Structures are given as C-alpha cells and as structure tokens.
Design a protein around this ligand. Structure first.
Ligand SMILES: Nc1nc2c(ncn2[C@@H]2O[C@H](COP(=O)(O)OP(=O)(O)NP(=O)(O)O)[C@@H](O)[C@H]2O)c(=O)[nH]1
Ligand SMILES: [Mg+2]
Lengths: 56, 178
C-alpha cells in the first residue's frame, strides 16, 4: 500500500516545486527578500516533508 | 524571550567540495558518508539538547559554483553564522575565504553581527599541506575569529565547530547595545 505516503509524496513534490522554481527564478538574477525568506521556509518544509515520508 | 536562542541558522560554504557534507552527517547521524550525492539544496536539521533545552540547528549544505548561486548567495540572507570550510591542500580555497566573506557582507551588513568560523578539514593529509596553518590561524586572528582543525575521517573537533558557532549566535541574538 501507499495510502498516506501518496499525499506525502505529492506534498514533497509540491515543496520541491516551490524550491525548484525559487531556485531557477533567482539564478536569473531576480531575487527579493520575500523570496529569500520563503526559500529557507519552504526548504524547512521540504526537509520536514522528508520526515513525513518516512513517518507514514 | 529565548525562542530566538533555541533556533540556530548555520550556512556551510566551501570551494566546491572539501568535505562540507561529511561533517554535517557526522554531527547528525554519527555516520560516515558512504554514498550520498545530493546536498545541492538538500539538508536536514539536527535536534540537540544542551543542558535541558532541546535546541534546533538549521543547516544548509549549499551548492556553490556559479550556476546555482540561488542556493549559495541568495540563501545567505537568512543565516546567522557561517562556516568557512576549506582544506590545507588547496591554497585556492584559502584565498577564496575572503571572497566568501565579502559575498556574505554584500548581502548582510545592516543586521546585528555576523558570526564567522573558519573550519580546516583534512588534518589527516599533513604532508600534502599546500597552505601553512600558521597563516590560516593568523587569518583567524586577523578577523578576530577562531580557526579549528577538523576531519570527518578521524572525526575530531566536529562537535566543537557546530556547538561553538551556535553558542555565538546567542550572543548575537542578545545583542550588545552597550
Ligand atoms: N576529512 C576527510 N574527509 C574525507 C576523507 N575521505 C572522504 N572524505 C569525505 O568525503 C566527502 C566527499 O566529498 P566530495 O567528493 O566533495 O562530495 P561532494 O562533491 O560534496 N558530492 P556532491 O558534489 O554530489 O554534493 C567529503 O565530505 C569528505 O569530507 C578523508 O580522508 N578525510
Ligand atoms: Mg555535497
């Protein structure tokens, strides 16, 4: 089964997406304090999601 | 309030490799890196309890080359302390320490205080030394900081560099205003 892990994996992908976009967008030279703080923030959520994955 | 003290932000930078991935896994899992590639943006937080308080240290092993500057430079903002990790076989990364320092200064200057700790990895090479620790330690004196010899091979002073820097973060969060 993968009942609960399914939602976790999709959430991980969402957080990876958030991080990935912020990474690709900012490498182009566009960055803002909203982005920098969110960068760390979503990162901490990504790592928490990693825990959530091995949690279920 | 001490909620800003139970939370530590530490960014570890280098010339590319050096060994700034192994030290982290050592301090977290007590395990040597057998095979762990990622660490591009992938990083974990370590739960440590100092004399009663469960403290969280938020670590980032950031990519630093040119491309993914959005992971190295763009992440520098939300980081209290910085670990400059190089090896004494590389005179280049030794010279680059000043570059990293100023990179941080360019993004952080109007805040309280920037805790810097220079970490020398691979004190197990010895004879392969291309840059004398004598001037490296002199740089510590130059910047008013500390220089510590470490290695994930022998597993020495790994705890020190992590705890030591995080403790300074408390002093920065308490501020001076004297
Ligand atoms: N101190 C020390 N570290 C060692 C020794 N042998 C291997 N290592 C560790 O092996 C790890 C491998 O480093 P490196 O090849 O740069 O990995 P990386 O480039 O960060 N991987 P990636 O580029 O995918 O993120 C380092 O963290 C280093 O500390 C040794 O003899 N001494
Ligand atoms: Mg790595």
């Amino acid at each position: 089964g993968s009942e609960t892990q399914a939602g976790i994996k999709e959430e991980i992908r969402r957080q990876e997406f958030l991080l990935n976009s912020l990474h690709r967008d900012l490498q182009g030279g566009i960055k803002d304090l909203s982005k920098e703080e969110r960068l760390w923030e979503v990162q901490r959520i990504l790592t928490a999601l990693k825990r959530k994955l091995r949690e279920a | 309030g001490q909620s800003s003290l139970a939370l530590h932000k530490v960014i570890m930078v280098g010339s590319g490799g050096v060994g700034k991935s192994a030290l982290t896994l050592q301090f977290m899992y007590d395990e040597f890196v057998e095979d762990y590639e990622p660490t591009k943006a992938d990083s974990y937080r370590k739960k440590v309890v100092l004399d009663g308080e469960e403290v969280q240290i938020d670590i980032l092993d950031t990519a630093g080359l040119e491309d993914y500057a959005a992971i190295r430079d763009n992440y520098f903002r939300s980081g209290e302390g910085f670990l400059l990790v190089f090896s004494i076989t590389e005179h280049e990364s030794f010279t680059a320490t000043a570059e990293f320092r100023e990179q941080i200064l360019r993004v952080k200057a109007e805040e309280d205080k920037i805790p810097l700790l220079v970490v020398g990895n691979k004190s197990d090479l010895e004879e392969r030394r291309q840059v004398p620790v004598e001037e490296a330690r002199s740089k510590a004196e130059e910047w008013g900081v500390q220089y510590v010899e470490t290695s994930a091979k022998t597993r020495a002073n790994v705890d020190k560099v992590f705890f030591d820097l995080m403790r300074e973060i408390r002093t920065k969060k308490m501020s001076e205003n004297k």
